[PDB]
Amino acid sequence: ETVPVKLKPGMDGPKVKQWPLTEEKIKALVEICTEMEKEGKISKIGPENPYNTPVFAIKTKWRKLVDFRELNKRTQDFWEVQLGIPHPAGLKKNKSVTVLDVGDAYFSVPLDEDFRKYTAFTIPSINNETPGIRYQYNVLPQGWKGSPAIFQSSMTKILEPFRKQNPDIVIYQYMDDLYVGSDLEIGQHRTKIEELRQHLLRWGLTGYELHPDKWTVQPIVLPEKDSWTVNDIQKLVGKLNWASQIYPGIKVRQLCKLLRGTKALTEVIPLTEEAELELAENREILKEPVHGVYYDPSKDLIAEIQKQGQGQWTYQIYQEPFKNLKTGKYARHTNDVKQLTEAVQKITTESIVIWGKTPKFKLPIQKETWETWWTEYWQATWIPEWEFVNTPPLVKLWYQ
Amino acid sequence: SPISPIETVPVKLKPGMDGPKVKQWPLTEEKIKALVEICTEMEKEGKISKIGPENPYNTPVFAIKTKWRKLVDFRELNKRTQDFWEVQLGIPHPAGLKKNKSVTVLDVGDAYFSVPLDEDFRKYTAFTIPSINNETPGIRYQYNVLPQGWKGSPAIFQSSMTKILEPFRKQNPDIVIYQYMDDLYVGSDLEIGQHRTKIEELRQHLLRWGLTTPDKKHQKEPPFLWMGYELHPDKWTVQPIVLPEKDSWTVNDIQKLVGKLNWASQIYPGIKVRQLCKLLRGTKALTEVIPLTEEAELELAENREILKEPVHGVYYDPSKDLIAEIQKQGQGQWTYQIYQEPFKNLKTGKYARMRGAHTNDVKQLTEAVQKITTESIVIWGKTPKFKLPIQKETWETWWTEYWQATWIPEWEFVNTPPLVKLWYQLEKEPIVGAETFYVDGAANRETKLGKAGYVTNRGRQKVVTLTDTTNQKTELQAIYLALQDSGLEVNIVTDSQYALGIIQAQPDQSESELVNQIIEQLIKKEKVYLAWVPAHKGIGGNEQVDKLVSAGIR
Numbered sequence: 007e008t009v010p011v012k013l014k015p016g017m018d019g020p021k022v023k024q025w026p027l028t029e030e031k032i033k034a035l036v037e038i039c040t041e042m043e044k045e046g047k048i049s050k051i052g053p054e055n056p057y058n059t060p061v062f063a064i065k066t067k068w069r070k071l072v073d074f075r076e077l078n079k080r081t082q083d084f085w086e087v088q089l090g091i092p093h094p095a096g097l098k099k100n101k102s103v104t105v106l107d108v109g110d111a112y113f114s115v116p117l118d119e120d121f122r123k124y125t126a127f128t129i130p131s132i133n134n135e136t137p138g139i140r141y142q143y144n145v146l147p148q149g150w151k152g153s154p155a156i157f158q159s160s161m162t163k164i165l166e167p168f169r170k171q172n173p174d175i176v177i178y179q180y181m182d183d184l185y186v187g188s189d190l191e192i193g194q195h196r197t198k199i200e201e202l203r204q205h206l207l208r209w210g211l212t213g214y215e216l217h218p219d220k221w222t223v224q225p226i227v228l229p230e231k232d233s234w235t236v237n238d239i240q241k242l243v244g245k246l247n248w249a250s251q252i253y254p255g256i257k258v259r260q261l262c263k264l265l266r267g268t269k270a271l272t273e274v275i276p277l278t279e280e281a282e283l284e285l286a287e288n289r290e291i292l293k294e295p296v297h298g299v300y301y302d303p304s305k306d307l308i309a310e311i312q313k314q315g316q317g318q319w320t321y322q323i324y325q326e327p328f329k330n331l332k333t334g335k336y337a338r339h340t341n342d343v344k345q346l347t348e349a350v351q352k353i354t355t356e357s358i359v360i361w362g363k364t365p366k367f368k369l370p371i372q373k374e375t376w377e378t379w380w381t382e383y384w385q386a387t388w389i390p391e392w393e394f395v396n397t398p399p400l401v402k403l404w405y406q
Numbered sequence: 407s408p409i410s411p412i413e414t415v416p417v418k419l420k421p422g423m424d425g426p427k428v429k430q431w432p433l434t435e436e437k438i439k440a441l442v443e444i445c446t447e448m449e450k451e452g453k454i455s456k457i458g459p460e461n462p463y464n465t466p467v468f469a470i471k472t473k474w475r476k477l478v479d480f481r482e483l484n485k486r487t488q489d490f491w492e493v494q495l496g497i498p499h500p501a502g503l504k505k506n507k508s509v510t511v512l513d514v515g516d517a518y519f520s521v522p523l524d525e526d527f528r529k530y531t532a533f534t535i536p537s538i539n540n541e542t543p544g545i546r547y548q549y550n551v552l553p554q555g556w557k558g559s560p561a562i563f564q565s566s567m568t569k570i571l572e573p574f575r576k577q578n579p580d581i582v583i584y585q586y587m588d589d590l591y592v593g594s595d596l597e598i599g600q601h602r603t604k605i606e607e608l609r610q611h612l613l614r615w616g617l618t619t620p621d622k623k624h625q626k627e628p629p630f631l632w633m634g635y636e637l638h639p640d641k642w643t644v645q646p647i648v649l650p651e652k653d654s655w656t657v658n659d660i661q662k663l664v665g666k667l668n669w670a671s672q673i674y675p676g677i678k679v680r681q682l683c684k685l686l687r688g689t690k691a692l693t694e695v696i697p698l699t700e701e702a703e704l705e706l707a708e709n710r711e712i713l714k715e716p717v718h719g720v721y722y723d724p725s726k727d728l729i730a731e732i733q734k735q736g737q738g739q740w741t742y743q744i745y746q747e748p749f750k751n752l753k754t755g756k757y758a759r760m761r762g763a764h765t766n767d768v769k770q771l772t773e774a775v776q777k778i779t780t781e782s783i784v785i786w787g788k789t790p791k792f793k794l795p796i797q798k799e800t801w802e803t804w805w806t807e808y809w810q811a812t813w814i815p816e817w818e819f820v821n822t823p824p825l826v827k828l829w830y831q832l833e834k835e836p837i838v839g840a841e842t843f844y845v846d847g848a849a850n851r852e853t854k855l856g857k858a859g860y861v862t863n864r865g866r867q868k869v870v871t872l873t874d875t876t877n878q879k880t881e882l883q884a885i886y887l888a889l890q891d892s893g894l895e896v897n898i899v900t901d902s903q904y905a906l907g908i909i910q911a912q913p914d915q916s917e918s919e920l921v922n923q924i925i926e927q928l929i930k931k932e933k934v935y936l937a938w939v940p941a942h943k944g945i946g947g948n949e950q951v952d953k954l955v956s957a958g959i960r
């Protein structure tokens with residue numbers, strides 16, 4: 007028997023256009039899906055199925071990735087406000103957190119017959135020489151948010167012994183990934199992870215290492231120079247004025263006092279010392295977390311990224327504009343797109359660890375450039391939501 | 407004409423909707439007769455079957471012109487039939503087909519009639535031939551095969567067509583069969599002997615599954631006219647283009663001209679269209695004569711010159727790389743060529759699109775690279791190696807300092823004037839010994855009136871009045887003033903993030919004349935530094951221009 011799944015009323019299944027793929031990626035998918043079919047995991051379908059979801063191939067063994075973002079929106083009630091997997095606060099505090107791909111667990115559990123038609127995907131052909139190769143799932147698919155919701159019961163069973171034997175180890179599940187955290191020495195951690203993999207192995211399952219306790223905020227940094235030009239104070243007041251909008255108790259009145267009359271930019275003006283009081287106290291406030299800002303479990307997370315040049319990228323996570331939950335950075339052949347997809351991934355996994363959900367990304371890139379290239383460097387099993395924006399010229403420099 | 411033995415495709419109505427029940431309109435005795443003759447014949451062939459008044463559904467029928475056609479208005483049924491997945495998400499492009507020694511063309515006669523309909527759906531296709539006037543009950547039929555004009559026929563026939571060819575494709579891997587609609591393109595690199603043989607082998611496999619095709623004496627000969635293309639076994643081109651020389655040109659004549667030209671641009675390099683397209687914008691009256699502008703005339707003349715002698719394209723070799731080349735043709739116009747062997751083009755093309763309000767040549771070049779990259783992937787399954795009229799250093803500089811993430815796959819410089827360059831660069835640091843212009847603008851929202859001006863550290867000053875203006879336009883005017891009255895080295899401080907933005911992106915063209923004026927000034931200068939301060943904060947010189955432009959405004 008299968009656990010019955012329905013959609014939100016008024017809205018039905020996904021009808022998303024499939025992105026054109028390169029020959030090598032098409033061949034890899036054809037092979038993957040041929041094998042997958044000979045094992046009853048998926049079945050060919052006829053044109054009576056109007057539904058469609060994009061499919062991609064990532065990486066030395068090619069693997070299938072299904073963009074279920076649309077299907078997940080249209081079944082959001084099921085995996086959240088119905089069968090939601092709770093989120094442990096301890097995970098962000100751990101010295102070490104290990105991520106394990108656990109999505110092979112889903113192939114064993116069959117999918118509700120009424121639902122299978124919504125998981126339809128097309129493998130496109132080059133130059134449209136044939137129509138696509140249409141398939142639908144018979145078992146829980148990787149990337150669908152309903153799969154971990156259903157498998158929960160089976161997953162608790164698997165982990166029960168290990169959980170009982172190690173009560174200071176956190177296991178959190180997000181989609182196809184299992185997040186395991188401990189405060190143990192790194193050698194012991196990796197031993198417990200090895201141990202855990204053995205437990206999964208007895209149910210036919212199968213790393214990449216994070217250190218969340220060593221995550222510090224990126225403070226908005228004020229210049230620390232001797233001899234200040236007019237332009238520098240103008241730069242300074244602008245940076246602080248915008249910081250007043252987010253940080254409670256930012257002061258600027260002493261800095262303005264210096265700039266009176268129409269002075270030249272290059273003209274050096276020797277400073278006071280009451281302004282140094284503001285410089286210091288603002289610096290003190292700029293390194294601390296923002297007072298008055300708290301994650302709201304009912305609102306979306308937004309992540310914004312700025313290109314800083316020389317392989318550097320700054321980013322901010324918030325729900326209400328400039329009310330920052332978290333700021334940070336990312337540094338580094340290597341290209342802009344590669345760097346951007348790597349930052350997106352880093353930020354997303356940080357967001358999963360901290361809040362239990364992916365942010366909606368605002369990407370400083372051309373929609374088309376991103377869409378043809380993002381897969382070439384993508385490694386994650388999930389895909390976050392993304393917009394395409396123009397970075398305001400000032401925001402960039404206010405984040406160093 | 408046989409009806410294929412293949413499995414039926416289950417069809418459903420849209421959730422909670424019943425079949426069509428539209429009344430049959432009273433027909434003339436002439437129309438009724440013709441419908442009866444058509445229908446009995448269609449019934450003999452198995453295409454339709456007789457039903458009684460136990461079937462509650464109905465769909466209207468009409469008859470139109472020696473010979474009559476039967477028409478069935480499936481509007482209501484189509485509005486009630488389930489949605490199907492798109493029959494095709496694109497037509498195959500000739501430039502993406504492999505070269506073949508021998509090639510022949512098959513077509514399926516009476517496509518939809520040759521393929522059965524889901525038994526449990528057949529009852530919804532019911533129609534009625536009415537009797538003379540009111541009188542007696544009409545003869546009631548229903549469809550057994552896919553009916554012409556029904557929503558699901560295109561998808562189901564194609565679906566069936568894949569299933570049928572699939573087994574044949576297996577034990578014939580070194581043969582390619584392209585199929586679109588009821589057309590079949592069969593190519594192989596075998597001799598005229600075992601080719602015509604293997605084709606008559608395919609025909610047999612087709613008729614075994616109720617699909618009828620023409621034999622050797624009937625099957626078509628190259629050049630194959632298809633979808634506006636001329637197709638040979640080793641080359642391809644577009645169908646002959648005729649540009650009619652006209653005493654006067656109406657909007658309609660111009661629209662058709664742009665269309666023919668756009669179509670031809672797939673293979674004829676250098677085709678231009680901008681001046682011709684310029685005439686159509688600011689749209690109205692279809693039959694009104696539009697007098698050609700002088701620019702349009704030499705564009706048209708240049709177009710006739712390219713279309714003077716015929717050009718063809720070649721096919722695709724998977725083992726060889728793709729080389730794409732792009733040239734700048736003029737403002738906003740870009741042209742490209744794709745080939746594998748130097749100057750034997752697979753296809754050509756053009757890019758023009760205006761992305762946003764203010765751009766520059768480097769931005770437009772990478773927009774063209776993206777568009778071509780996508781097209782190559784669709785057509786060939788791989789990206790091409792680019793050859794661009796931009797220096798590596800010029801590209802390096804732009805990419806490094808721009809806010810946007812950008813990428814171009816393997817590319818190389820090629821010296822084909824005009825070369826793509828930046829025309830000015832702003833300063834990183836404020837200039838020593840240059841006048842500092844503090845600029846500002848202000849506009850009233852009711853009167854629409856505005857003032858733009860500057861104050862400088864060298865005591866200088868100016869205010870100008872504007873009438874049909876906005877806050878943004880007064881900021882750009884302020885910066886423009888400062889450029890005119892400054893000389894070759896300037897620092898400018900503004901409180902407009904908007905104006906900062908436009909200028910920092912180093913545009914060289916714009917839809918705005920005012921911005922174009924700022925551009926021509928910027929290039930004339932030697933060193934420009936531009937900076938930003940917060941508005942209404944009582945800052946330095948900004949407070950002084952603030953009082954000026956506001957006077958009698960806000």
Ligand SMILES: CCOC(=O)c1c(O)c2cc(Oc3ccc(N(CC)CC)cc3)cnc2n(O)c1=O
Binds near residue numbers: 511630
């Ligand atoms: C010579 C006089 O006959 C003609 O005027 C004439 C043709 O030569 C012709 C050739 C075709 O061959 C093709 C079949 C398939 C394709 N493709 C789609 C699968 C592209 C690979 C292309 C051409 C298809 N239709 C044709 N039609 O309709 C004609 O009226």
Ligand SMILES: [Mn+2]
Binds near residue numbers: 846847848881902941
């Ligand atoms: Mn202003």
Ligand SMILES: [Mn+2]
Binds near residue numbers: 846847941955
């Ligand atoms: Mn002002």
